[PDB]
Amino acid sequence: KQYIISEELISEGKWVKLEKTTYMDPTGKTRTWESVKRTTRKQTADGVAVIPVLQRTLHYECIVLVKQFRPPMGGYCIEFPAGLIDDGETPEAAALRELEEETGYKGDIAECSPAVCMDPGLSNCTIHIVTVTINGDDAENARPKPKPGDGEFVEVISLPKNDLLQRLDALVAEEHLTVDARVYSYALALKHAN
Amino acid sequence: KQYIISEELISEGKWVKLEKTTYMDPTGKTRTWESVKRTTRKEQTADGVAVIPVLQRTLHYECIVLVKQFRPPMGGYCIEFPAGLIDDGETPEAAALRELEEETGYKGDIAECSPAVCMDPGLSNCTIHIVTVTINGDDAENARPKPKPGDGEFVEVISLPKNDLLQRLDALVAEEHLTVDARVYSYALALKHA
Ligand SMILES: COc1ccc2cn[nH]c(=O)c2c1OC
Numbered sequence: 001k002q003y004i005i006s007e008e009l010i011s012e013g014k015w016v017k018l019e020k021t022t023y024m025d026p027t028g029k030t031r032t033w034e035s036v037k038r039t040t041r042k043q044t045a046d047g048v049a050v051i052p053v054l055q056r057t058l059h060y061e062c063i064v065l066v067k068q069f070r071p072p073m074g075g076y077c078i079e080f081p082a083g084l085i086d087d088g089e090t091p092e093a094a095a096l097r098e099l100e101e102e103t104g105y106k107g108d109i110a111e112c113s114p115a116v117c118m119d120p121g122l123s124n125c126t127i128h129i130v131t132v133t134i135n136g137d138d139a140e141n142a143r144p145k146p147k148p149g150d151g152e153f154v155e156v157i158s159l160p161k162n163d164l165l166q167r168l169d170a171l172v173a174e175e176h177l178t179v180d181a182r183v184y185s186y187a188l189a190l191k192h193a194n
Numbered sequence: 195k196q197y198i199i200s201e202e203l204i205s206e207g208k209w210v211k212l213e214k215t216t217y218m219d220p221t222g223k224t225r226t227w228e229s230v231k232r233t234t235r236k237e238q239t240a241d242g243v244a245v246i247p248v249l250q251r252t253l254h255y256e257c258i259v260l261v262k263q264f265r266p267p268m269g270g271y272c273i274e275f276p277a278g279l280i281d282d283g284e285t286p287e288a289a290a291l292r293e294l295e296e297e298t299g300y301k302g303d304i305a306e307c308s309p310a311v312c313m314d315p316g317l318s319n320c321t322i323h324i325v326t327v328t329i330n331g332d333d334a335e336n337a338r339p340k341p342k343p344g345d346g347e348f349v350e351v352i353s354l355p356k357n358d359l360l361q362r363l364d365a366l367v368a369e370e371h372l373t374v375d376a377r378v379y380s381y382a383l384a385l386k387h388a
């Protein structure tokens with residue numbers, strides 16, 4: 001019933017562009033929308049986000065998260081490890097790579113989502129969510145070596161999976177940080193389950 | 195360590211603007227970023243709300259109520275939590291209950307309200323509150339719910355059992371071209387992982 005008629009470029013940066021989208025509404029009426037896109041898409045999706053499940057025997061299972069300054073937010077955010085997919089990289093491979101660069105951990109793929117949208121009333125940005133387990137008792141994950149690219153400055157924060165929502169709430173109250181909506185959604189559902 | 199030095203408008207639409215952001219990196223060097231913001235945010239603690247609506251009914255499994263709409267930025271149909279912007283002076287809770295009733299017909303009860311969480315913080319400053327609401331589906335109010343959709347709003351309701359949410363979503367993606375929202379997918383994944 002609805003579809004895109006045309007897209008008019010408004011402004012194109014190096015990394016992000018802004019378009020005016022014309023579309024057909026279901027009544028037969030032509031309407032416009034302001035849409036954002038990345039200039040970097042190639043690929044199945046723009047990026048990946050990694051759900052990294054740190055598994056150490058006789059310890060609580062942890063979700064590994066990252067804390068970074070985010071210029072669009074003007075502040076620090078707590079997020080799943082994440083980056084753009086290199087041209088000719090599988091989502092799985094982008095996941096293990098971004099997890100290593102950001103956390104130093106070496107992980108194993110558990111499952112991989114279809115492409116899923118980030119904020120579809122604003123942008124066409126999509127990611128694959130990739131669930132990865134980390135054998136925290138293996139020697140390669142003993143002293144994890146985080147390999148930042150240029151301009152990445154990442155702090156690693158591991159939180160117990162069984163208390164994740166309360167732990168995130170605590171960081172927000174004490175540390176004046178913003179939690180990512182996907183991380184919060186995950187945490188909420190761990191509480192809502194059964 | 196890191197902070198914003200300047201925010202230069204690049205291009206301003208009616209709804210969305212693009213900025214050149216200058217910030218201080220943790221080495222003490224000046225860097226830039228391209229940043230998206232909405233033009234509609236005022237004194238609200240966030241741009242919007244998304245609603246996790248738990249539909250509860252005697253001798254029924256709980257359902258998660260979702261919505262399907264055409265999203266012009268995406269060029270197609272998306273499945274998402276009911277959601278909308280917070281009106282000036284409106285509380286996040288009120289906005290959630292309002293959007294839920296407008297998009298689904300259901301009258302909910304507030305359960306919990308998150309702090310402001312970031313939608314895509316490498317791109318935009320956009321934030322929402324995630325508001326968990328229960329819907330008493332035994333109540334006459336919620337018997338034959340009809341959406342009160344706004345002008346240009348065209349929303350289909352899809353209620354899926356919480357206990358099988360991820361597979362049910364996969365079965366919808368398998369049957370037509372549509373994108374699941376990353377918050378929905380994350381929430382469904384944690385239901386599985388729990
Ligand atoms: C009914 O409200 C709207 C009308 C046009 C637009 C256009 N571009 N983006 C929006 O987000 C938008 C919107 O939603 C805030």
Ligand SMILES: COc1ccc2cn[nH]c(=O)c2c1OC
Pocket residue numbers: 015084150151226227228229316317
């Ligand atoms: C380290 O790579 C980058 C350098 C500058 C930028 C600037 N604006 N947006 C980005 O998303 C971005 C980026 O990440 C894709």
Ligand SMILES: [Cl-]
Pocket residue numbers: 053110131133387
């Ligand atoms: Cl797992």
Ligand SMILES: [Mg+2]
Pocket residue numbers: 081082083102
């Ligand atoms: Mg990253």
Ligand SMILES: [Mg+2]
Pocket residue numbers: 082083098101102152
């Ligand atoms: Mg990275």
Ligand SMILES: [Mg+2]
Pocket residue numbers: 276277278297
């Ligand atoms: Mg909406």
Ligand SMILES: [Mg+2]
Pocket residue numbers: 277278293296297344347
């Ligand atoms: Mg609405």
